[PDB]
Structure formats: C-alpha cells, structure tokens
Design a protein around this ligand. Structure first.
Ligand SMILES: Cc1ncc(COP(=O)(O)O)c(CN)c1O
Ligand SMILES: Cc1ncc(COP(=O)(O)O)c(CN)c1O
Ligand SMILES: NC(=O)CC[C@H](N)C(=O)O
Ligand SMILES: NC(=O)CC[C@H](N)C(=O)O
Lengths: 410, 410
C-alpha cells in the first residue's frame, strides 16, 4: 500500500456486510430505499438507453442538459445566477464530490474541522489528503419535556471557536445531518460563518438530504449567508433527491475559483460520469423543477410521505423502550438502547456497546440497524455508543414486518 | 489549489474544445463511436431501469453479477480461476482503474516508467501521486518496403533496462496502443516481464482495446507471462468492449494483495459504481460469453467490422499523400503529414507542427483529427510532431463524408 492510504483500509460498510444477507432479517440499517423511485425517473433512463449518442461520452464536468437543469433549480434556491459550466461540477455521487473537494483544496498538515457524529467517510478523506481532522462533538441540551428531538442537539460556539487556528483550512458541515437527523438553524450556521470569515477558511457543506426536512424546520444553505458564497462548496446528490442511490451522481456548487480546483481533480481521476444517467436525470429535474410549487413535485411529496413513516417509527421504537431522537430531517432515526439493559453478557470482544447490541438484535429479534459509534472518532465512541441508527425510507410492508418484531419483542 | 494538483489543470481534451464545434466539420478526432452499440446492450439498460432494486446501491467493489461474469470471461483468457470479489475491482472507466492503481500503489518519489507516445492521463496521474515519470520513446525500424505498420515501431530493450532503478515502482503498459495502434508482441512483453521481475516492480497494463486486434496479430496479456500474475494490474473497459463509451465502467484484475489497495482507494473516493449500468453490462457479457466460438459474438464481429474500416481509411489517407501507419489493433490510425505541403506561416505561434496542421485541416478541409504531440512529453514532441491521429470507429455514412472530403482535397 501507498502511504497516503495507510490505515484507511478499514471501512464500517465493508464491516456491516454480514448482518443482513440472511433473508429472514428485516434490514433497517443501510440507507437502501425499497420504495419505488418515481415512475418518470425509471422511464427517462429507458428512453436515454435507446438513444445511441446518450450511450457515448459527454462533457467531462457534467452533461450539458444536466448542469443546465442544476443551475436553474439552484439559481432559484440561492436567488442568484448559477454558472452551469464554472460553478457546477457533476461527480460520482456526493462521495466523489467530497473527494474532489478535499483533494483539490486540502494540503498535508492542514486542519479540517469535523462535527461528531460524522458521515463516516469524512475522516479518511481528510487523512488520505495528509490533513489533520479536528473533532468537535454535538452535545444534547435539556428537552422540552414531551419529546426528544434532533433540535435538542447542538454545539458549544466557544468550543467551536477554540478549534479554529491558523492551521484550519476548512470545516465540514452536514445538514440535514446523518446520523442525527439535525437540521442546522440559521443561528448555528451564522456562528459557523463568522468563524470561517474571521479565519479565512473554507466550508464544505454536505447537503444531500436538503429536500428531506420536516414540519417545524427549514433547510438553510450556509453559502447563502454574508461572506460565505466565495468560500463554500455545497454538495447534493441524485440518489437522495430522486431516491435512486444506485445512479451515483452528485454535484458540487460554489464559486468558480474553488470549483476549478475540483474540476482539476476530476479531469485527473475518473474524468466523466455516465451519459445515460446524466441524460435521464436532467429530464427528471425539468419535470419537477416545473411544478416546484405543487404538492405533486417530488421535492415536496417525498418528505411529506417520509414524515408519516418517521412518526410511525418513533412509535414503534417507543413501544419496546428505545428512546428515539425524532429527526428534523433525513430518513434516519437514532434510539438510545440502554434502558433495555440487554443480554450482551457473552459477546467478549472489545467492540463498542452499540455494535454488540446490533449483533444481538439481529440474531435474536431478526432486525438490523447501524451502531452510531460507526460515525465517531476513537475518543468520541464512549459518548455515543448506547445509540443505534434506524432507516425509514422503506415501503409500508417493510415497516409492517418491523412492527411484527416490535409487537413480539417481550 | 492543493499542491498535489499544481500545474495539472491543463488538459489536452479540455483544450480541443475548439473546432469540433462547427456543424459542417467531419470529426475524426476524439474516440467517439458514432456506430450503434449492440441492440441488446441498449435493451438490457432499459430492462434494468424498470427494476427498482437495480436503481439502488450495489456492492461497492462491483455488482455481483458483473464481477461473476468478468471472472468467468477473464478466467478463460488467463486459464485460471479468478476470484470475483478479491481479484477484480469495478471502477469508473479505465480512467478510474488507472487512478485507483496509481493512488493505491505509488508513493511520492517513486519512479514510474511510461512509453511515449502515451495516452495523456498517465503523466498527470503519476505527478499527482508525487511520483516521477520516466519517459522512453517507441522508435521506428526499417519497414518491409511494402507498407508502414504499427509493428515497425518498437523499443530498445537496453534503453528500457537503463530506465529501471531502485526508485522504479512501476511501468505503465498500453496494448493495443493508443495512439499508434501497436499490438505488443510476446517478445516485447517478455523484455518488460524480465525487468519487472528483476527489479521487483509493478506492471499496470492498460488493455481497453484488447478485443480490437486485426489479422496477423494476437492480444497477449503480460499478466500471463511467468512471474507476472503477482505484479500486474490489468485494466479493461465497457466503453471499448461494448462501444458504449458513455457508460464509464472499467475493471482492474490481478492478485489480491494488489487489488485490495485499489479497493481502499475506491472506498475512500467514489465508493460504488452505478447499479443499472453494471446490471445491464453483466447481461451483455453473459450473452457474448456464451457464443465466443461464433462469428456473431461481439468480441469477434466488431474487430472484423473495424478491419474493413481501417483498410478504407488507409486507402483514403494514401489517396491524398498522407502516409498512414497501418494499425495492428485499436481504432485509431496515425498519418504522417510531412510529405504534404505546409501552409503554415499564418500561425507562427511555435506550438507544435501537428497542432498547426490540424487547425489548417479543420478550417480548410472541414476534417478534424488529433495532433500526436499531445501524447508526448516535452522532449519527445519534436520526434512525433508531424504525426496526426484519425478515429475510424465511425458509421459508413461518416466515412463517406470523409471520402467526399478526401476526393475533393485536391
Ligand atoms: C451525509 C451523506 N453524504 C454523502 C452520502 C453519499 O452520497 P452519494 O451516494 O451520492 O455518493 C450519503 C449517503 N450515504 C450521506 O448520508
Ligand atoms: C488507452 C486508453 N485507456 C483508457 C481510456 C479511458 O477509458 P474509459 O473511457 O473507460 O475511462 C482511453 C480512452 N479511450 C484510452 O484510449
Ligand atoms: N455505503 C452506503 O451505501 C451507506 C450509506 C447509508 N446512507 C448510510 O449512511 O448508512
Ligand atoms: N473523452 C475523451 O477524452 C476521449 C478520449 C479518446 N479515447 C481519445 O483518445 O481520443
């Protein structure tokens, strides 16, 4: 192995393969939608398949009709003109966008601030770049009494500030947050923005779940706050927006002077993304862009549908004594499992509690989930290891099977 | 920009975004097939599109049906049992496979040997890894007097040996060769094998054009030579194999102890490739794998169809005083351009001779092509700068438009 990848060969997802290959297990762990994607998304891909040209090379930095649809949709959200060619880069998922961003912008010995828990890829991407991840946790605060929510988690602005130094190149922001479901507030973003401007750092903002925010909350884009446009890369994903995780297309949106460096990594790595997927996606966008104010727009109908499933899930977790944290956004929910005081007596590894719990739940109850300590750096693990993450982008019948397990639990 | 991409922002193909544009020009430049993909390749993509699961995330290192198909096909070629999970990585094109190999295997300060002319991405990919490209040119031999062919180019084994030191990490091999169409001989591969074994170096073998070898030549895989399986990564491409360049799926095949490091790059960069493309590509493979014996197999029928088109191009180029180098393989043909009359003081730009010629032929003859100096490091360019490359993976009607241009040349 090359030095840049020393110790980066472990991967939580490669780790979690085994859990649910067993067909009789209900899998609420990985973010695999088993709802149907919209009919027209599948239709448009079939249509593109039969056009010879759409099966040949397209523009390296993104299919022209696609980046054009992206600049239209995001121009409305940002309330500014987005340049399709210079301010957008289409990459292989939000992963590939994150990869372009760190690879083109982050040097060895640079510091990168990461909020804990974090989508697991952030830490190894920062390391393969020779950079130093700097961790800060989200801490709970007292609850309103009736409900535990994502909004009861936040950061200490004084603690955040202390993480910023002359070596900080960037901070990574994930809102709506995976695994917590947190929708960052304008006040939180403002504290983040103040510091990035004051230290002259970048913000890389992972916003794949941007459409999935629930009543009481709103997606705010940090790159729309004063001084932030010039210093933010904001990332979206086809998989999340159209429920086609398997298309693996995302985009980075930001200023031309930053996006050019992302574009230089891409030209020198995989170069271009698939033409047929990008062609179909452009069409899907236009179909929904043109009804953005209608309920039937997929940007509106999916979170509306997911809010119902979310609520059903919180009731299911409650019925067995799991303390759910009701998410403001996204399609994951965390439950504290410690009030079950489960029977993990003879799992004798040095794994965190949540991993043992999940292995135990899979074997005994036939239900899998993801340990939140998978989204934590070594020192943070003991502070989050009683927490397990459940996925609810699932068809009713799947959540029915889940309900059968919760009803039979004792 | 990050330091790692310093000076790597210029891209040959980004630059040629000049006169491919104008409507009336016959483009024989970029490797863009304008023939149809096989009908079943297209139908299989349409069918995967309508299966919901084929739109969601698949195995990270390659869709299981696709790695199994590639296992079975390549295991016949190699006469060995290839492990589909450990000895194969599906990536985003041959580009992505090349990136995985260099990123996962090559350190700052390593030397990487590259044979000139080289497919252009080799050099910046080695520079991005902090390594030193060590150039050796292919050189001409006396012809049989009758015709000029790719096999009249070779390398000096003694000069190659002198490129190997204790800093050498690897040699990049490209057979059949782009741009010049060379199908490296068993005796050439043996000289490279002897030196990788003696120095304990890697060979990264880029064999995207492996099926496209014409009469009197045989694709031989260096990884099949004694002692080479354990030091070789061999790369393939869907875009070349099934004439669907826009699908951006390639693969690396080789021993587990090397493939795992490519796997580590990929899990940390883009992770997963697209599911519907991989599903459809697995089915396109099973179809052709079952009929390898038969002339109807795409592995057989395409090289046959293209050989006719190569022979046509060589007649058309001869017709106008461009001396073609007849390719053993691939879908590019170089023509020597020096026996024509120049223009070219209307430029004076002292950029290479071939770049001036290609601008002159675009403007005045309405035909584009690629200057060979684009595939050459700085010191080599004077040895190759009268050479121009043409693509013939084109429909009959495109080649007729080309015919009409040659007919009207004088
Ligand atoms: C926060 C976050 N970022 C990025 C991704 C990956 O995005 P993509 O599938 O487009 O590569 C995910 C989905 N696993 C995610 O939850
Ligand atoms: C020799 C060679 N290797 C790799 C590639 C790129 O392969 P892909 O399109 O699958 O990424 C090309 C482009 N045709 C090539 O000519
Ligand atoms: N590698 C994957 O597909 C994992 C993604 C899934 N959304 C997760 O966060 O759990
Ligand atoms: N998209 C591309 O860069 C096409 C490259 C093509 N194979 C060529 O060599 O001309």
């Amino acid at each position: 192995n090359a030095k840049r990848i020393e110790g980066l060969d472990s991967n939580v997802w490669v780790e979690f393969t085994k859990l649910a290959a067993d067909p009789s297990v209900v899998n609420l762990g990985q973010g695999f939608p088993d709802i149907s994607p919209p009919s027209y998304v599948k239709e448009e891909l079939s249509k593109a398949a039969f056009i010879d040209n759409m099966n040949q090379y397209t523009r390296g930095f993104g299919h022209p009709a696609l980046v054009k649809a992206l600049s239209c949709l995001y121009g409305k959200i940002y309330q500014r003109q987005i340049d399709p060619n210079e301010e957008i880069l289409v990459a292989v998922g939000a992963y590939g966008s994150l990869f372009n961003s760190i690879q083109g912008l982050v040097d060895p010995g640079d510091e990168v601030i990461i909020m804990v828990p974090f989508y697991d890829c952030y830490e190894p991407m920062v390391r393969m770049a020779g950079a130093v991840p700097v961790f800060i946790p989200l801490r709970s605060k007292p609850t309103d009494g009736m409900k535990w929510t994502s909004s009861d988690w936040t950061f200490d602005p004084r603690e955040l500030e202390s993480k910023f130094s002359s070596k900080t190149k960037a901070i990574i922001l994930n809102t709506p947050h995976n695994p917590l479901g947190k929708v960052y507030t304008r006040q939180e973003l403002q504290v983040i923005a103040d510091l990035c401007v004051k230290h002259d750092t970048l913000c890389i903002s992972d916003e794949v779940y941007e459409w999935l925010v629930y009543t009481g909350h709103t997606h705010v884009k940090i790159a729309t706050l004063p001084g932030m446009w010039e210093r933010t890369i904001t990332i979206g994903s086809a998989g999340k927006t159209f429920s086609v995780t398997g298309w693996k297309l995302g985009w980075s949106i930001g200023p031309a002077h930053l996006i050019k460096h992302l574009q230089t990594v891409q030209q020198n790595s995989f170069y271009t993304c698939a033409t047929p997927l990008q062609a179909a996606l452009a069409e899907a966008f236009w179909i929904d862009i043109k009804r953005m104010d209608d309920p039937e727009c997929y940007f509106n109908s999916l979170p509306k549908e997911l809010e119902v499933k979310r609520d059903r899930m919180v009731r299911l977790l409650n019925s067995v004594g799991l303390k759910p944290i009701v998410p403001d956004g996204g399609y994951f929910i965390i439950a504290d499992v410690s009030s079950l005081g489960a029977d993990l007596s003879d799992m004798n590894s040095d794994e965190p509690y949540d991993y043992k719990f999940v292995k135990w739940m899979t074997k005994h109850k036939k239900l899998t989930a993801i340990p939140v300590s998978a989204f934590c750096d070594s020192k943070s693990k003991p502070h989050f290891e009683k927490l397990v993450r459940f996925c609810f982008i699932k068809k009713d019948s799947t959540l029915d099977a889940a309900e059968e397990i919760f009803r039979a639990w004792n």
